[PDB]
Amino acid sequence: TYKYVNLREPSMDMKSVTDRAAQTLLWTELIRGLGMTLSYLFREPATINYPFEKGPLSP
Amino acid sequence: XXXXXXXXXXXXXXXXXXXXXXXXXXGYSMFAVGIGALLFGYWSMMKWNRERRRLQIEDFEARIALMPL
DSSP states (O other), X not given: OOOOOOOOOSOOSXXXXXXXXXHHHSOSHHHHXXXXXXXXXXXXXXXXXXXXXXXXXXX | OOOOOOOOOTTTTOSSOOOXXXXXXXXXXXXXXXXXXXXXXXXXXXXXHHHHHHHHHHHHHHHHHOOOO
16 A cells, blocks of 8 residues: 655755754754653543542443 | 444544644744853853952952951
8 A cells, every 4th residue: 555654855955954953963852752741741640549449341 | 123333433533644743943943042042141141250350359359458467
């Protein structure tokens, strides 16, 4: 069916090169990766304590 | 009457949709804030060191003024 995993050179000239260099010079995407866990911290966890609460089952 | 499991699709959950997109940072605009904070950083810091000089000379003047010491 074909889907292709390779990007085949995202940077070409001037504008497309600098932003691909900016993420490697400092971080940016690591700070963006930091934000993924940041919002994940605030949302309520699905946890069941066994001696009081019980997990889902079936007939 | 026969009752079995019914079919339901409705929205089809959207088959393969991209969620990753560029947000906040653009490229050239981040350098204007990045290097801009540096130029603001030095100018604010060096003015305090010039104010430190006002204290510095006045501190060493106390030693020259004190000869009975």
